[PDB]
Amino acid sequence: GLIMMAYQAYDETIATGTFFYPVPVNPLFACPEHLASLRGMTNARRVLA
Amino acid sequence: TLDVQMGRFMETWADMMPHHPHWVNEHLTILQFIAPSNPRLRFELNPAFDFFVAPGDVDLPGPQRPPEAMPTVNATLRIINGNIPVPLCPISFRDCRGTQLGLGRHTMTPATIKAVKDTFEDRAYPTIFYMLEAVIHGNERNFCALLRLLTQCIRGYWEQSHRVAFVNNFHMLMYITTYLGNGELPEVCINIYRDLLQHVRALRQTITDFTIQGEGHNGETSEALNNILTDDTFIAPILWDCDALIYRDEAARDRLPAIRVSGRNGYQALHFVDMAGHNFQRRDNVLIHGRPVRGDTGQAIPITPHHDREWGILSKIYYYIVIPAFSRGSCCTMGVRYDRLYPALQAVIVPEIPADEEAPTTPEDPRHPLHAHQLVPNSLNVYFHNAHLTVDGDALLTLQELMGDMAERTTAILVSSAPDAGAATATTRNMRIYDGALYHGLIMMAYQAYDETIATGTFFYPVPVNPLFACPEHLASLRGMTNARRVLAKMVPPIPPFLGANHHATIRQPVAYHVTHSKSDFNTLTYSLLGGYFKFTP
Amino acid sequence: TLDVQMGRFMETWADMMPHHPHWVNEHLTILQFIAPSNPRLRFELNPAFDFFVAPGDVDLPGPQRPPEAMPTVNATLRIINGNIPVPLCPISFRDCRGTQLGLGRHTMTPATIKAVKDTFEDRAYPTIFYMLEAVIHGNERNFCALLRLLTQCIRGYWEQSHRVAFVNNFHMLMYITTYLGNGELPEVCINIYRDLLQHVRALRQTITDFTIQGEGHNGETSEALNNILTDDTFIAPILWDCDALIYRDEAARDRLPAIRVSGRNGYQALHFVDMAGHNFQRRDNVLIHGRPVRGDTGQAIPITPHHDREWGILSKIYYYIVIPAFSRGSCCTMGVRYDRLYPALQAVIVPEIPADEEAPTTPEDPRHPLHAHQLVPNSLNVYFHNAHLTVDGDALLTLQELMGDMAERTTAILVSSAPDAGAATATTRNMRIYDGALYHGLIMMAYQAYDETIATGTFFYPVPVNPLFACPEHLASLRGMTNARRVLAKMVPPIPPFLGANHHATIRQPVAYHVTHSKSDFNTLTYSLLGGYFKFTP
Amino acid sequence: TQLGLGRHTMTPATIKAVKDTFEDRAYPTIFYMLEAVIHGNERNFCALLRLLTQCIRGYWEQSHRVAFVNNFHMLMYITTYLGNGELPEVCINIYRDL
Amino acid sequence: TQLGLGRHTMTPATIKAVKDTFEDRAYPTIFYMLEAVIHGNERNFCALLRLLTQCIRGYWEQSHRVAFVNNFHMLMYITTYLGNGELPEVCINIYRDLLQHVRALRQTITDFTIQGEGHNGETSEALNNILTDDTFIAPILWDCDAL
Amino acid sequence: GDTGQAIPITPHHDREWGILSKIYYYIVIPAFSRGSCCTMGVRYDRLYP
Amino acid sequence: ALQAVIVPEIPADEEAPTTPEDPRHPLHAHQLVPNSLNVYFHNAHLTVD
Amino acid sequence: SNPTTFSVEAIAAYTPVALIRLLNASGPLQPGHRVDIADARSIYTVGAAASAARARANHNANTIRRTAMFAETDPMTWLRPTVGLRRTFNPRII
Amino acid sequence: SNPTTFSVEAIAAYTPVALIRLLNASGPLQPGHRVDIADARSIYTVGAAASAARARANHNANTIRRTAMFAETDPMTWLRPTVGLRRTFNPRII
């Protein structure tokens, strides 16, 4: 796996989620912001995430 | 339209006003609204109702020529705090929220509020990267693909005097610091957007820490009821990229409607008016869109926000957040105009060179382009030939990657906004909140005043409402006459009719003129503002 | 006509009285308010009625020559009370109103203000440019044709150590500040110029937050209510660009005769020295007005405000603001007569800037104009280099594509300023309160006269004039006589009394002693100049 | 605070550079790609010394931010191999400090 | 200390350099000879400006010492002509802070007098102080004007 | 002027010469030298040649 | 996407280019073809050989 | 170009407007004669910008054509991801 | 030029005054002779002004004609106002 230091949402040389997808396993490494990389993320799921 | 009933506007604001100012009261210490026997208090009242001015409710929006007789008693709405009435206290309490809110979200030093003293105080500003900013303005566009013109803006142009451009507007930098972080730029123009990067993303650490995960309420994005930073009733003058007015029109479940466009109407969410539209004197209000990706180009595709539901509203709070008070407030605004800036820069200045002789460096010659027989009066040679900002060969000539994207601007819609779940007890159906917004401008405020270019004029005009970004020395640019808008407008400047009133909701004269008498700090002044909007709900 | 002015105005100030007795004291400490050696009290008991001796109300004004003294009784209002009459005082409580009246927005530090301490103390002043700014008489439509000579001058006059340029008196910084804050240098001069107007520009921010405006019934000057800083028509010590004739006969409905300009009827509006000039050897008059680039012919082009009512209170707003006290007082002002720049400045010898190429900088060896192949004495050139530098091709062969403001000398319009209106008293009427002006001369700090590079009898002359400077050192004017005026009254030096008597032209002598006695904080005597003499008028 | 009374501490320069780079969103996706594909193999890493040296020597003396600080089996390899002078003086100091 | 509570003071650079010159024992005799031959005659000084420029620049920008400070007619003509740009930063600025201190002292003489008492063709200054008394003459004279 | 013979002598500089020269020589010089400097006359007959 | 490298064919007895301004450099204008590794490295401007 | 014949402004004017180097707008005008005007302006708009697009043809001898520009289909995308050439190179082909 | 014939100062003198390299005013004078004098100074004026106004002739082979300095009408202004130069370019036509 990999760890991304910080997430930018708006980067367009790589379409979102082209190479990496969020798989967070720790309370330490939770990422309410990285979940935009997930394919098919709606309003409710992230804002509840 | 906006040229006539207009500025001859004050005149018929003299069927009207020289009796100076009553609840005008906004400036001293604790006493000329807490001592004993006075004409104007029977008004500023209740924790219900929120009374204000108007006639015997001649109905309210519409026509032009009204009567005068006979009427009633009151209320009418508003939605902040930062603002409990006028003198309970003379330094401590907010730039107080500037010595008790931020501790080890820590303290300061020479180099980044370096980036602070010489980009918002004194007297030295531009005009044709003015042009280049509308070679700039906001949604995606295919200018997403090239480098060298501002490349050499740099190459001559930090070396100027500690004070250069672009720090009030709201599109100069997005998808760039989305893609490339490794190879163009140094380390005292390279370290002042990252280290002041993640403590307003540690302000991401400072407006979703101190509350609450466990229990929420009534279906508006989130936990929306909210308050004054985070839910589903703040969209706005927000007139940069794409998410929020139909944020007013594709999130679900409350009440019963109306609006205006100060125009006409029908709504479809179609698009592509086509080549037959450069469009410079006539009559319509339907919304442009222009090229889609995971959309798809042409004529059709569906219309949802450009991008998601975290950034563009990012626009809109810290919007209700830190520039003027930066600026000495030195600045101010107006409107502008569109057939000179519309074209003498899209061809005739590239002709025939004897080109292709080796790499170009340093400025003294009969070559590189700003010179002595391709400018004399009458068109396009002293704001991209005044000021030696000097450039390169490929960005500003050629004709099939900047023709593309031009012009159809600013017709526009008049709100009925609805703060969140806090009007359900029988107050406010038609007790609507207009609260007011933009729809197609530019970005200036600059006192290129004593400045012998803009000769008291020609091109551009005024368009004047919201109630923060305004400006003190005015009476110098809109006219027709001798001594007008000031000697009846000296303390909170001259007011309008129609876009939703600086009145009719939550806004008066609010960060300018109460510490326009106590400006604690660079900074303590800056710990309460990221705290500045309280209230009284469940 | 102005010189044997010398001859018949001091030699009837010919033979000296036997004790100069009761008004011009100046130097001791305190409780000499309190046991008189010395006078100041029977023309001293309360100011507001205070009632001089008073010859014949004198039918003021007429011609020159003398009788002996009869007065009436009394009235005229020293509306003043705050260096209040006096003689018991020290320097804690009003450099005081400058250190408790003012709390927190933009204040000073190491490089650039006690900077302001190691450029404003030299006595040997230079010679071209402070006369470049009379080739012309002060520009909106003449200053736009030039850039190279003046300012490239102190490019070179840069290159040895830290001796920055173009600041103190107003003439070098805001119209043509409002776009040259530049870049091809290295480094510290302008950019912080631009740090030289926004600090005090916190003026603009520190006398329009105390007032009550719109105070008008008939619609007054509140621009004569709360800070006579702000209104138009006062015109501070020493005289600048065009609006005179139209702020005292096109402001409102109660104004009534008394005015002068040397001679006969008023002034009548014929027109302006341009291509139709021999008025250089003849007797008194002409009053020139303006001739724009956007102009075409006609007969009188018409009445309305020039520039108008802003640029009037902030620039002429270092007249109250900056120079003689961290100075300790060097700037010394005079008017002119206009011939060693308006009839004599020649000599014509160079070859062309060589044929058809470039122009870089560095200084070495023989062929040239600023080379003595054109410098023995007679032109402008050997004249020119006492110091260490170079020159060029289009900016000095100049004198033949801008100059032509030749001229005569140093005019003016005498008149009597007008009633305080409703606080009230009038019916003793005929004795009005004049107040002055003057419009083509110079000012000067300290220079060199025991003596080895510069002349006498062509282009300079004393003046002691407009009161807030203190100049001890112009010991060198006008010879053939006794020992009279430097070791008999170091009490009393020269003035005359009518363009104003600083009795009738009453500006202060504050900075005088305490700028020959005041020092703890490098900026606190400024604190003695913005709360010293305001209006409490009524 | 009690535990770390006399123990080793991080000099402020490394704290600042490290804070910027973790904080950073400059971090080019090429760096993530290299970190993923190498996947912490000594033979793979020791093959790409030249390219990685160019990568880091670049990204540092042009933004003063430390790269590859993400994966643990990156700064061990860097400190063990690119420590004798291939990198500038400051960078290896930051890595050694971590 | 009470008199100069705030009169102009000399910045530490000029103090250090002037003191170092005054304590220099290798001070070249050329300066003494030139000051003797010039003898403070202005027509003589203004003729030698190039040579004096070169001499002072050479003496300063090798040992950071100010030259020609002994004679009042010599630091003075320097701080009037060779103070225009022939000489770099600290040289003249040293001359200039020195002379500013001189004028601050003169203004200090003008402090504490009572203008007012000029008896028998004598200023209040010369009745009060001595440095402003015309009868008292300088230790060395270059011109006959003082007499 | 003409140097001449009948033209009488005039001061080169005004009176402030005396005041400034006296202040300098009697304050600034003794303040720095501290009684080490000495005043002497020259031997022109041995200098000019 | 990692298999698209656009290194040119350097002639024998020729020096390897270093600066990215010559056409032989892999990061030069001429050899940036869309959708390769070079567009990644230039979309991060890592001057590599 | 012919015949319309040449923009003198005037209010004819003609849609393109096939010039380079209009030292013409002024130049003299001087001023516009007695016609209605309003557009007028449009005719100058469309055809002047045409006078730009057709004024080129060339400057393509040293470009450096356009690019894929982004990450998006690109009708394959199933055997390689898409990335866009942001053009920091000095596009010259020398 | 001829005949006036040559300014020797004297008080003739003549109106232009069409010389360059005047080692003439001084020169010797020596001094001005026995005439009334006053103007002189102004006949010196309108002529010394010609003395380089005419003496330009050249140095227009390097220029750089003027600009509108500023702009207002500017006989079109309806799609085309201006600004007059400030031209830091170092003007020599080369």
UniProtKB/TrEMBL annotation, chains H, I:
Signal peptide: none annotated. It is found in: Virion; Host nucleus. It comes from the Viruses. Participates in the assembly of the infectious particles by decorating the outer surface of the capsid shell and thus forming a layer between the capsid and the tegument. Complexes composed of the major capsid protein and small capsomere-interacting protein/SCP assemble together in the host cytoplasm and are translocated to the nucleus, where they accumulate and participate in capsid assembly. Belongs to the herpesviridae small capsomere-interacting protein family. Interacts with the major capsid protein/MCP. This is Small capsomere-interacting protein. It comes from Human herpesvirus 3.
